[PDB]
Amino acid sequence: RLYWDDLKRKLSEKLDSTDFTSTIKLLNENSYVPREAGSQKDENLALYVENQFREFKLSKVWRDQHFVKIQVKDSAQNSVIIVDKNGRLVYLVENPGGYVAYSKAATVTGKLVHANFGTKKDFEDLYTPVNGSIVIVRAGKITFAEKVANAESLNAIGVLIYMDQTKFPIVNAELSFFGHAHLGTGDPYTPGFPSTQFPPSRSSGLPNIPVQTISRAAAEKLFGNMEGDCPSDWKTDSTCRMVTSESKNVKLTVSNVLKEIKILNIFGVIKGFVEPDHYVVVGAQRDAWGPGAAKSGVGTALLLKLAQMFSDMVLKDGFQPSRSIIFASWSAGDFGSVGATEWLEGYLSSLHLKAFTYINLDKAVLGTSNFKVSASPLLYTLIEKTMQNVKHPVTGQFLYQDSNWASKVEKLTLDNAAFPFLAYSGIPAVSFCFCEDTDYPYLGTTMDTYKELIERIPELNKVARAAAEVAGQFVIKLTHDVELNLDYERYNSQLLSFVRDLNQYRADIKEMGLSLQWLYSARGDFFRATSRLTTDFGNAEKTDRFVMKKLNDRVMRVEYHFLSPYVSPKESPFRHVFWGSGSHTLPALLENLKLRKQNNGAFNETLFRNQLALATWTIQGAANALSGDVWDI
Amino acid sequence: LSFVRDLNQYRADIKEMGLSLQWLYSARGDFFRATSRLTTDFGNAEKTDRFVMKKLNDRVMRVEYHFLSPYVSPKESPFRHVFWGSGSHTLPALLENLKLRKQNNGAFNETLFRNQLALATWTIQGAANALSGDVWDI
Amino acid sequence: TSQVRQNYHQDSEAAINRQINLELYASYVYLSMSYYFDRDDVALKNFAKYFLHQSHEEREHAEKLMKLQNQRGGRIFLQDIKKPDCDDWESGLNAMECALHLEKNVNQSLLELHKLATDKNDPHLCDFIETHYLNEQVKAIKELGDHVTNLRKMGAPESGLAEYLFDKHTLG
Amino acid sequence: TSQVRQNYHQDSEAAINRQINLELYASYVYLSMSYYFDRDDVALKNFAKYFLHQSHEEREHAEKLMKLQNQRGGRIFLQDIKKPDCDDWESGLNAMECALHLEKNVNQSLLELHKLATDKNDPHLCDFIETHYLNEQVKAIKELGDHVTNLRKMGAPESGLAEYLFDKHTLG
Amino acid sequence: TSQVRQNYHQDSEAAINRQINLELYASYVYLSMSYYFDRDDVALKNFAKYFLHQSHEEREHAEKLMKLQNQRGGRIFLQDIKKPDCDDWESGLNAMECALHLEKNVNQSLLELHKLATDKNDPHLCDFIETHYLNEQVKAIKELGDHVTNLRKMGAPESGLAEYLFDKHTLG
């Protein structure tokens, strides 16, 4: 067993002589260049990664194979067409190079209406009714899946998406791009039974309208046939317009088809010396529509180098992780973390007893200016201590520069592989990156190349190196300390913050005959439960692996006990009342209640009483799950 | 065994529906393996080492719960135990739906069965996987 | 519906309108290139003549597509002709490289058009594209490739002598 | 500054660029008009021929202005060529009326250009406009006026016979 | 990769090289046949002239394919030209029958080439094969069939008089 100081030094010095750019460049070679999930090139890289793991001599390397239905574009072209309502003659504007996976295959003709980013707010602020019209929106702010849903929610009949030059200062205006519009993760077409025969989807999160990505040039050509200046508030090109002329409307034809593919998740593992049946999981997306250097290459490179380093530290330098470290190369990430989700779904309710943390490595390097982090609050302390002794690659200062960084942390979103881990599986998760206030413009394009990457970021090797150090320090701390570096006390602030918000309606809870007393008591009981647990840790003999196991297991279950037990994972997979999606999340409870200031019928008093109940029960349950022995109350 | 033994009394009707029972047999096999490994582990454990026993005992303590179907809400159907609970998610329900296929009456529900078959298989696999221990042991 | 229309898909009609615009755009690019070489500070008269001829050929290409649209009973829909990507074409070599890129883009559009015509089982339109456009594009691309190669081998763009002599011997 | 430039005001240079765009626009209007008459449901081949010729003349007008810009040491700056105001020109008479309006607009632009050249004491530019443009516009406007008059007197646009016979006798 | 290459599959490139060899082989077969009829013990000068012309046509066919390879940015790869199957062609009739068999073999190769071009969605290559090769093969095969028929009906190969008169009337 080594000292944390030595492990820190060892990791750092191994990192110093590590060549990241070579690997990123290597992954950008023609053997791997265009690696859409399931393709032979994806399969090539999968084989290469797998071989590398074998050369690193990890305890065991294996395959997690899955068959899934994705959507690819048909031999028939998707098309964007302008129609003259006079005589109904059509003019072809574009056959897009790209497409949007999970779009309804259909042909729709209507008026075209701009809706900015297609955010929920953008739609309400519209002075043009979207109903029965095709909508065009800029990429960014929110996922394609959300834009489609918001629009579909207002009865739009189709969606176009372009990259405006203000948000995406790309010189080539003919650039086409890719994404998906499945409002979830995993395979949307997952019949619980094999079939020839065709069953409907139900609560799939799939679009019922066609959605399609277009080049900025094609959008500006559409603007050429539209009227109305865009609000300066949108801060967009002067090109932009709002609505088709009276005599014209647009026709969209999407003919994407379902294809079944064989994806491979490639796994390596360094077994733990004390509790090998518990793991930290480190993963990266291996697939990409185009070259996907930043989208896929960076992550996969870090995955490979981290795997190599840790294998060397165990075999040469005497590092002895208490718990196991699993390295995961995912496929079909581009379709909604499909690879990751399929694997997660094998262990719906059991995984949280083995995996205590997931570290995502996707898009860790996109810029230089900033260091962003999204994570479970359970990892805020680990993250903080890690930023306090990792240096900025350009700047030289420690990453930790703001004592208040934790309150400004944004939550994991659906397009992040870290999301299903936390919100569906109840495993604390963290994603982080070096970046700007600007999205990396080339993501999802054929311009996401190494050359492009090394050009916007000439210090690529140093920056990737800093990204590896944070992930590496995470992984060491997590498998070295006898306690788990999961700060369960953090959820007191979260509950406090939530009740603090809720208490801004102590009046409206009166006019409904409701007391919030049982909820306050749940919050109090959780506080007590954490306090008792901290005391127990302090009074425990750190060398007694039996008592530590028992205390650590309690910590490992905190996250999962915030998954609502009162909703089916099939109907709503994202059960986490803090971080998931649906009417069972604390945020939903607040939004339903904010709709009570308006005397409009949007408020749903009944729903709220149920939400209040389920929240209280969930929180009580978590407090009770943490308290320990049934005679201690 | 008893349950599959019963189910196998329809290996014909599973043909006329384009279905294989192969993934279910494999789940049953995997559970068998998982228990065998666990018994071996107990035998090889030092009965005086409360840490290793804790770990093995905790695995035993979770067997029962992993037969609660993870695919049904406890509010809609509280009795989730696929052996002992109530509803369309229990193994018995799967059999009863299938026994309704000898009558050419519309009571049989082929679609439901394919879902039942799936959920059962998944539940059983999950339990086998939950019992196997360390993820590198497979 | 037009009394002459037969086996002519609305998608093909629209694609023909898009191609008309592209041909007109190509005409405009070549017009711009031509007069760049007519500048007193560039002064390569045979480059200017070569590109002006290419410009006029593209107008003929556009006109033939407009004729085709009417022949098949489709309706011509025109859009703005975008200005060329560049104002200053830098050198004879750079202009040739831009022309090569342009002709390859136009070819790709024509191949997409042919794929559509094939998908809609329109053999008349397939034959029209093959006869009047596809080999013309292959010849144009080959010629521009040859020109680029010669200019590079001669030492362009650095060698003003190279572009001068190419102007006289190849384009004269 | 260009080694050839002399007595050529920056305002004149800009105005010449605007005129180049207008000439190209006029070429496009006439191109659109021409193919309208080539439609199977319009089918007046001499109207089509007449307007196609007018279109080609406008391209020549644009080219001569581009030549002038370079002759004087100005720099050509191109902008998008806007699509014509109309897709369906309705009748022979209506197309002639649109052409008349177009040529009068172009003439007004040329007169404004001449006024600028006069204000900047540029007699070479004045003479260029007078020689190559002003009388051509007067002749074009007079011809279109004559055509409109004849079509009206013959009974157009209601009389399909009038436009048919005008197509044969005046434009044939 | 060649700066001109576009939509040209490596399989098509290879197939074009194989076709070049076949055309050269056909040229050689016809050259051999020609000089057989120039032997003092055969002495049919119009058979000799006919086959020599056919030989030269095949060289032209090969050259056009070499041109095509370069036009599309492929690279010519040559192989040995195999000697013809026969040294002594026996009679005018037998030579015609061999030529018929040869042209049908060449046609089959061209049809396989077209099938490949179709599979790779290469309409330029399809059109090239159709335009320059497929009907030429159909005409050649028909002509040779006609010749074989006439020689048989006249009494060849037994009748030396038949081949003599065919030489004068059909090939003269």
From Swiss-Prot, chain B:
- Source domain of life is Eukaryota
| Gene from which the chain derives | TFRC
User: What does the subunit comment say?
Assistant: Homodimer; disulfide-linked. Binds one transferrin or HFE molecule per subunit. Binds the HLA class II histocompatibility antigen, DR1. Interacts with SH3BP3. Interacts with STEAP3; facilitates TFRC endocytosis in erythroid precursor cells. Interacts with GRM2.
Residues of the region (Ligand-binding) are 1-138
Disorder noted: Immunodeficiency 46: An autosomal recessive primary immunodeficiency disorder characterized by early-onset chronic diarrhea, recurrent infections, hypo- or agammaglobulinemia, normal lymphocyte counts, intermittent neutropenia, and intermittent thrombocytopenia.
Family in the record = Belongs to the peptidase M28 family. M28B subfamily.
Q: What does this protein do?
A: Cellular uptake of iron occurs via receptor-mediated endocytosis of ligand-occupied transferrin receptor into specialized endosomes. Endosomal acidification leads to iron release. The apotransferrin-receptor complex is then recycled to the cell surface with a return to neutral pH and the concomitant loss of affinity of apotransferrin for its receptor. Transferrin receptor is necessary for development of erythrocytes and the nervous system. A second ligand, the hereditary hemochromatosis protein HFE, competes for binding with transferrin for an overlapping C-terminal binding site.
Q: Which residues of the whole protein are included? A: 619 to 756 of 760
Q: What is this protein called?
A: Transferrin receptor protein 1
The compartments listed are: Cell membrane; Melanosome
Q: Glycosylated at which positions?
A: N109
Organism name = Homo sapiens (Human)
Q: How is it modified after translation?
A: Stearoylated by ZDHHC6 which inhibits TFRC-mediated activation of the JNK pathway and promotes mitochondrial fragmentation. Stearoylation does not affect iron uptake. N- and O-glycosylated, phosphorylated and palmitoylated. The serum form is only glycosylated.
Q: Look up the further comments and give them.
A: Serum transferrin receptor (sTfR) is used as a means of detecting erythropoietin (EPO) misuse by athletes and as a diagnostic test for anemia resulting from a number of conditions including rheumatoid arthritis, pregnancy, irritable bowel syndrome and in HIV patients.
Motif Cell attachment site: residue span?
A: 28-30
Induction profile: Regulated by cellular iron levels through binding of the iron regulatory proteins, IRP1 and IRP2, to iron-responsive elements in the 3'-UTR. Up-regulated upon mitogenic stimulation.
From Swiss-Prot, chains C, D, E:
User: How would you summarize the oligomeric state and partners of this protein?
Assistant: Oligomer of 24 subunits. There are two types of subunits: L (light) chain and H (heavy) chain. The major chain can be light or heavy, depending on the species and tissue type. In the human liver, the heavy chain is predominant. The functional molecule forms a roughly spherical shell with a diameter of 12 nm and contains a central cavity into which the insoluble mineral iron core is deposited. Interacts with NCOA4; NCOA4 promotes targeting of the iron-binding ferritin complex to autolysosomes following starvation or iron depletion.
Which disease annotation does the entry carry? Hemochromatosis 5: A disorder of iron metabolism characterized by iron overload. Excess iron is deposited in a variety of organs leading to their failure, and resulting in serious illnesses including cirrhosis, hepatomas, diabetes, cardiomyopathy, arthritis, and hypogonadotropic hypogonadism. Severe effects of the disease usually do not appear until after decades of progressive iron loading.
**Domain Ferritin-like diiron residue range list:** 6-155
Task: From the UniProt record, give one GO term of the biological process aspect.
Answer: negative regulation of cell population proliferation
The terms under GO molecular function for this entry are:
ferric iron binding; ferrous iron binding; ferroxidase activity; identical protein binding; iron ion binding; iron ion sequestering activity
Quote the EC number: 1.16.3.1
What family is this? Belongs to the ferritin family.
Query: Which UniProt keywords are given for this protein, alphabetically ordered?
Result: Acetylation, Cytoplasm, Cytoplasmic vesicle, Iron, Iron storage, Lysosome, Metal-binding, Neurodegeneration, Oxidoreductase, Phosphoprotein
Report residues binding Fe cation 2.
Answer: E58, E103, Q137
InterPro entries from the xrefs?
Ferritin, Ferritin-like, Ferritin-like_diiron, Ferritin-like_SF, Ferritin_CS, Ferritin_DPS_dom
Reported tissue expression:
Expressed in the liver.
Q: Where in the cell is it found?
A: Cytoplasm; Lysosome; Cytoplasmic vesicle, Autophagosome
| Pfam families, A to Z | Ferritin
Q: What does this protein do?
A: Stores iron in a soluble, non-toxic, readily available form. Important for iron homeostasis. Has ferroxidase activity. Iron is taken up in the ferrous form and deposited as ferric hydroxides after oxidation. Also plays a role in delivery of iron to cells. Mediates iron uptake in capsule cells of the developing kidney. Delivery to lysosomes is mediated by the cargo receptor NCOA4 for autophagic degradation and release of iron.
The record ties this protein, via PROSITE patterns, to:
FERRITIN_1 (PS00540), FERRITIN_2 (PS00204), FERRITIN_LIKE (PS50905)
User: Record keywords: Acetylation included?
Assistant: yes
Task: Name the enzyme's class.
Answer: oxidoreductase
Keyword presence, Acetylation: yes
Ligand binding (Fe cation 1)? E23, E58, H61
Q: Which GO terms describe its cellular component?
A: autolysosome; autophagosome; cytoplasm; cytosol; extracellular exosome; extracellular region; ferritin complex; ficolin-1-rich granule lumen
Query: Annotated site (Essential for association with cargo receptor NCOA4), which positions?
Result: R18
Give the domain of life: Eukaryota
Question: What Gene3D superfamilies does UniProt report for this protein, alphabetically?
Answer: 1.20.1260.10
Please write the reaction equations for the catalytic activity of this protein.
Answer: 4 Fe(2+) + O2 + 4 H(+) = 4 Fe(3+) + 2 H2O
Enumerate the SUPFAM superfamilies for this protein. Answer: Ferritin-like
| Protein name per UniProt | Ferritin heavy chain
